[PDB]
Design a protein around this ligand. Structure first.
Ligand SMILES: CCCCCCCCCCCCCCCCCC(=O)OC[C@H](COP(=O)([O-])OCC[N+](C)(C)C)OC(=O)CCCCCCCCCCCCCCCCC
Lengths: 48, 55, 206
């Protein structure tokens, strides 16, 4: 009743736009997690 | 959760292949130069023989 | 690990995509599908084993084959810390995602209240059988509220049957063979009279 922009409280879901958009904005955020780990592991020492 | 676990899993193998591939290339690459130094050393011996003929 | 671990992940994305109708939603599904395929891409390249003893023997620079081995092995020990990531993703994530977490939860509560309405009605309907076998005032008690509406028609003198009913089906059944087939007009009161009258240059208001 405070943080949802809707012209009615009778919520009717007819498309998954609002749903998939919030998923890509969520699952994408956790990208670079493995590459960031590679930085630490690889920046540890130089093979040579 | 299953997509992250499979991501780090397959990504872990990719890093493993990167290291072993690097450690193998550096070794093979070094061997290439090592063979080149040997050929250059022996090449000088042949060069000395040819110069002796000219003299 | 490699086989069968992505079967369920394909059914979910497929349904989510099928529900998408507008082009905008379909685009987000493509972005979502890419990230899933990106994270769920399988890596199989037959990581080769290194036999430093073989290279050490055939030919190598003194101290090199050993220096590579000791340095190589050191990095092989390092590995991803799956535990730390497992906790953060499960504790809290994407406070923006909480927007639809609370939207779909209230959206579902709306249609669960309706599901309970139809379910409870069919539950109470089990004891009600053969309306023609109940007395008049007992049937009205099953359909509580009709007596209240019936008093409103009486106290307002709307005693024309079916005036306030949008579809006076009872009025059509009685007029199936009537002369000048007509039903009462909507919300017609037996006391209202909109009659007019005018005087023109001609007689009879013509
Ligand atoms: C039983 C004890 C108590 C009895 C109480 C009395 C109950 C009377 C029952 C209702 C009678 C209603 C008669 C209405 C006739 C209307 C027929 C019609 O619509 O015409 C269609 C007709 C026919 O169209 P149709 O489509 O409806 O029928 C077609 C008929 N066939 C099938 C044969 C082709 O067309 C017309 O529009 C002509 C209109 C002529 C109207 C002449 C009748 C006027 C009389 C009504 C006024 C009386 C006011 C009295 C007030 C007194 C105050 C002091």
């Amino acid at each position: 009743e405070n943080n949802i922009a809707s012209n009615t409280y009778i919520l009717i879901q007819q498309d998954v736009a609002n749903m998939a958009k919030a998923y890509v904005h969520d699952i994408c955020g956790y990208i670079d997690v493995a590459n960031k780990e590679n930085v630490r592991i690889l920046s540890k020492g130089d093979l040579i | 959760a299953d997509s992250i676990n499979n991501f780090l899993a397959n990504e872990y193998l990719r890093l493993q292949s990167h290291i072993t591939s690097r450690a193998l290339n550096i070794l093979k690459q070094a061997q290439a130069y090592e063979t080149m130094n040997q050929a250059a050393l022996l090449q000088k011996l042949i060069d000395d023989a040819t110069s002796a003929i000219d003299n | 690990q490699a086989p069968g671990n992505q079967d369920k992940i394909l059914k979910w994305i497929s349904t989510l995509s099928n529900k998408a109708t507008t082009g905008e939603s379909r685009s987000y599904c493509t972005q979502l599908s890419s990230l899933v395929s990106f994270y769920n891409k399988q890596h199989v390249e037959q990581i080769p084993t290194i036999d430093f003893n073989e290279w050490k023997s055939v030919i190598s620079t003194q101290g090199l084959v050993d220096k590579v081995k000791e340095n190589y092995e050191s990095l092989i020990k390092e590995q991803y810390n799956t535990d730390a990531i497992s906790k953060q993703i499960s504790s809290a994530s994407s406070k923006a995602l909480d927007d639809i977490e609370n939207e779909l939860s209230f959206h579902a509560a709306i249609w669960l209240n309706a599901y309970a309405d139809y379910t409870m009605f069919l539950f109470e309907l089990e004891e009600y059988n053969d309306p023609n076998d109940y007395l008049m005032h007992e049937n009205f008690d099953f359909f509580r509220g009709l007596e209240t509406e019936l008093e409103e028609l009486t106290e307002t003198h709307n005693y024309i049957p079916g005036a306030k009913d949008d579809v006076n089906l009872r009025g059509y059944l009685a007029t199936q063979f009537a002369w000048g087939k007509k039903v009462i007009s909507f919300y017609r009161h037996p006391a209202d009279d909109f009659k007019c009258a005018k005087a023109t240059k001609n007689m009879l208001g013509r």
